[PDB]
From Swiss-Prot, chain A:
Subunit structure: Interacts with EIF4G1. Component of the eukaryotic translation initiation factor 3 (eIF-3) complex, which is composed of 13 subunits: EIF3A, EIF3B, EIF3C, EIF3D, EIF3E, EIF3F, EIF3G, EIF3H, EIF3I, EIF3J, EIF3K, EIF3L and EIF3M. The eIF-3 complex appears to include 3 stable modules: module A is composed of EIF3A, EIF3B, EIF3G and EIF3I; module B is composed of EIF3F, EIF3H, and EIF3M; and module C is composed of EIF3C, EIF3D, EIF3E, EIF3L and EIF3K. EIF3C of module C binds EIF3B of module A and EIF3H of module B, thereby linking the three modules.
Name of this chain's protein: Eukaryotic translation initiation factor 3 subunit A
Function: RNA-binding component of the eukaryotic translation initiation factor 3 (eIF-3) complex, which is required for several steps in the initiation of protein synthesis. The eIF-3 complex associates with the 40S ribosome and facilitates the recruitment of eIF-1, eIF-1A, eIF-2:GTP:methionyl-tRNAi and eIF-5 to form the 43S pre-initiation complex (43S PIC). The eIF-3 complex stimulates mRNA recruitment to the 43S PIC and scanning of the mRNA for AUG recognition.
Subcellular location, record wording: Cytoplasm
Entry PTM: Phosphorylated. Phosphorylation is enhanced upon serum stimulation.
Family from the record: Belongs to the eIF-3 subunit A family.
Modified residues (Phosphoserine): 12
Curated annotation (Swiss-Prot), chain B:
Chain spans, region Sufficient for interaction with EIF3J: 1-105
Protein function: RNA-binding component of the eukaryotic translation initiation factor 3 (eIF-3) complex, which is required for several steps in the initiation of protein synthesis. The eIF-3 complex associates with the 40S ribosome and facilitates the recruitment of eIF-1, eIF-1A, eIF-2:GTP:methionyl-tRNAi and eIF-5 to form the 43S pre-initiation complex (43S PIC). The eIF-3 complex stimulates mRNA recruitment to the 43S PIC and scanning of the mRNA for AUG recognition.
Family: Belongs to the eIF-3 subunit B family.
PTM field: Phosphorylated. Phosphorylation is enhanced upon serum stimulation.
Modified residues (N6-acetyllysine): 40, 119, 195
Gene behind the chain: EIF3B
Name under which the protein is recorded: Eukaryotic translation initiation factor 3 subunit B
Residue ranges constituting the RRM domain according to the UniProt record: 16-99
Residues of the full protein shown: 170 to 764 of 814
Curated annotation (Swiss-Prot), chain C:
Post-translational modification: Phosphorylated by TGF-beta type II receptor.
Chief location bin: cytoplasm
Residue positions where Phosphotyrosine is found in the record: 300
Function, in words: Component of the eukaryotic translation initiation factor 3 (eIF-3) complex, which is required for several steps in the initiation of protein synthesis. The eIF-3 complex associates with the 40S ribosome and facilitates the recruitment of eIF-1, eIF-1A, eIF-2:GTP:methionyl-tRNAi and eIF-5 to form the 43S pre-initiation complex (43S PIC). The eIF-3 complex stimulates mRNA recruitment to the 43S PIC and scanning of the mRNA for AUG recognition.
CC terms in the record's Gene Ontology section: cytosol; eukaryotic 43S preinitiation complex; eukaryotic 48S preinitiation complex; eukaryotic translation initiation factor 3 complex; eukaryotic translation initiation factor 3 complex, eIF3m; extracellular exosome; synapse
This protein's name: Eukaryotic translation initiation factor 3 subunit I
Family: Belongs to the eIF-3 subunit I family.
Subcellular location(s) of the protein: Cytoplasm
Pfam families on file: EIF3I
The organism of origin for this protein: Homo sapiens (Human)
Post-translational modification N6-acetyllysine, affected residues: 256
PANTHER family to which the protein is assigned, alphabetical: EUKARYOTIC TRANSLATION INITIATION FACTOR 3 SUBUNIT I
Amino acid sequence: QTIEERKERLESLNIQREKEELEQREAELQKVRKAEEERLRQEAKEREKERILQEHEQIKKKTVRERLEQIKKTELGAKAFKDIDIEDLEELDPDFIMAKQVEQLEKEKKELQERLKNQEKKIDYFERAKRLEE
Amino acid sequence: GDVLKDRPQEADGIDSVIVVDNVPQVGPDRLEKLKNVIHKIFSKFGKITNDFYPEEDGKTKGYIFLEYASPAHAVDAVKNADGYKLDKQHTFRVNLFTDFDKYMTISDEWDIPEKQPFKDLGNLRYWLEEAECRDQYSVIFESGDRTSIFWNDVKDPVSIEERARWTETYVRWSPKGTYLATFHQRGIALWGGEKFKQIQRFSHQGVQLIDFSPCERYLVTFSPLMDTQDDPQAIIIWDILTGHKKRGFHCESSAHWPIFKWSHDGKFFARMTLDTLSIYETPSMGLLDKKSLKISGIKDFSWSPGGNIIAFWVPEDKDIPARVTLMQLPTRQEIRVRNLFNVVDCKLHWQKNGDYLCVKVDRVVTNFEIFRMREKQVPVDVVEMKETIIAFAWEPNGSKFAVLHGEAPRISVSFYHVKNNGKIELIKMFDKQQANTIFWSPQGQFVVLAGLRSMNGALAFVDTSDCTVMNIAEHYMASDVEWDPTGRYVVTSVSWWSHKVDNAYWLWTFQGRLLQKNNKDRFCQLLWRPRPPTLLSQEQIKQIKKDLKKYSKIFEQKDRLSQSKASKELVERRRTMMEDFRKYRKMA
Amino acid sequence: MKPILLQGHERSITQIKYNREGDLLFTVAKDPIVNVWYSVNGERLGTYMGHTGAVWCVDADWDTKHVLTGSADNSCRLWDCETGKQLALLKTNSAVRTCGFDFGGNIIMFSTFVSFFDLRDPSQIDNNEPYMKIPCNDSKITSAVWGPLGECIIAGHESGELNQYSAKSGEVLVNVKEHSRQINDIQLSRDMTMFVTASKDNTAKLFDSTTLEHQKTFRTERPVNSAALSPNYDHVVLGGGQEAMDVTTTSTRIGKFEARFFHLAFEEEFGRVKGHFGPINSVAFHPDGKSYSSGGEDGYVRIH
């Protein structure tokens, strides 16, 4: 049974050595997982940063391109709002007072006519005297 | 004859004997000289039959007594011949039988009584009493079809008196409102009063033009129709008050009629006959024995408006400078001679108080000569303008004046003042107007800086205390501009007699704006009748010159109430009817 | 102002209307000759004479170009204003009594029945006949006219009635007894959006067209036959020759028919101007607000 004995161990020997190599074979697949991980993290920072940095510069560039005060706030240079209001004040108040003054003098002629009205009866006395003088 | 006061008989006489003046007197050689010249008196008496020579007690005679073949033909005898051939010193006279103790008839024993007072009461007395304004301007419509005299238009009344054919031809009012004058084929009528009664009428057939003396002694009438009652003439002079004929006068060339110019006070007058002066004293219609008032070789003349001084302008002779003349009215002597060289044309512009005279000198460099007539020795200030002056206007009664110069799109108004310290000043320039005419208010300052503006209202206004534009009238109608005598109305009007874009008269305030218009059918003439100020008391005029404040009473509400009462309800009865009428406007 | 009255006719004027610009007033009359006058200065340009019976009515269009008359002579007439020549002649079966234009000129009213006439200016035809007839309903229509753009028709009636027409259905709506006598004339407002009716029953009224509610009565002591609305002024005119409120009505030599000034919204009489020689038969007002018009038994129109 010596020939019989040798064969059984060989199956055990073959299976175990292969399985241990299979464990080694499994390990190599596992090592690949560690290998994959390294590239991704570096890229993650890089991908975001690379796009952002150009964008950050470009977004600032776009604003800077238009940071020129294209509207220079000196288009006409008057910058007038209260200009229309101030003129309206002097003319309106003066005209009323002046007219009243004007009216007063105008009215005064009637008042002078009242001084004249005493003279007007006096003038009829002159009219009477001249007719009397005859 | 020989006598230094030789005249014939003073009346027509008996019919049976002929009188011959400058006759065939007794004495050798003197007799045959008027043998024919007295056969003038006796030639139309038939054949002269006897012409006995009377001698005045042996002195040389001028007259003889004559008889004819027919005694009663002496009335014929003195008209069909005069001036038959004569020698020595006798010619051209005839009459009838040496009549004497001649007589004349004339109005006497003056008592004014009737017709003295309708004219006077209406204006310058009632006017002063009247408290409204606009100068109580008269009205003329449809070439005299309706003629109206009116009261003040600011108040409810317009029309004071209106009549048909009151003025058949044109219109005229006197300078102080006392009289209104009318023209007609039969003569002139003076009208006056609130009811515009007939004041005086001068019967004068076919009178073509008239004028009135400043002191009302004389009426001046001008006609293209000639009458023969007075010497060969085309002009009658009438006494305006009495209707009496004062004088008649010839006119050689009727170019313009300011022929009898008057003194400032109206006391004396001057008149040109061609290049000769005839002087009629305005008070007496008498000749002035003042030497200058018969002057030879003067060429233009006018009077001071406040000083009675005479002025003459004589254009420059070949070698002697042109010279302006100041002749005083009675003394007749020179107070100032103005000799200037290269003068081209001259116009005389006086100030209303007669304090200053401006001479517009053309040299073209126009020069103004301003004479300080009140300051002693009459120093003359010369204003050298440079740009073709087309108008001058004095401030009435003041020492300021206004001028207009230049091209019509760029016409400049310049206001000037003359000062007590001699130096003249331009107060303000108002450029680029269309003005060519000035109608100042009688009260000062309110100078109407406006052109003709006929159908194209380009009128403007300058006040002169502050050189300020008070108000503008855009009235196309305005062609003439005048201020009221009171100084409270300036009327801008149009004439359908003259043009046809408007036909109306507008009655406005002298402030500077047209208020409203009363239309006139043909607008022959529309004028404010004068309410001219005759006098004033300086003390009453001084300070307030009111009863309290502003004008008269401090309230000054006596007339002011009417605006609010009449508008809501004019008389209550009129109201309820007519209140609906413009309630409708808003609501509907 | 001065009113110029033209009395170029020997028989009664029958209707007046001013045109849009108002320099012409169009009038047709009881004498067989209608007349066209310049309203501005009162010069009479001419007469329209192709009718052979009393022409009861005239109105002038929105363009102020042509005037038309309708008659009891069995005809309806459109007239050339330059020479008065009848250029075409149309027969009608009855008297046309009141006229008033639609705002667009594309339609016209006629009073017979209440007739509706289309004008198809694109077709070079002024129709001889009305385009529609509203037949009578218990009464007879004395007067009728077309409101603005033809939207409503307002008719005054011989029985004192008012009638109302629906443009989209073409017919009459209702009436009410109000007055006792015949409607003599009817003329539209200036914008034609509302209207007044009139009758010889001694009452005058300001009426809403849209609701048929009696809104207002305008009082005179005289039956008013005609009124027109004036552009440039809010006015109503009240009218009689003979006082009309008494039997044996009598006139003065002067001519007691007077122009009466009234408020359109508020209704009061505020004064009068005499001068016409008959009952007012017709009325028109100037587009400037400068005139009013009276139509007399003497045949005259006076524009004031």
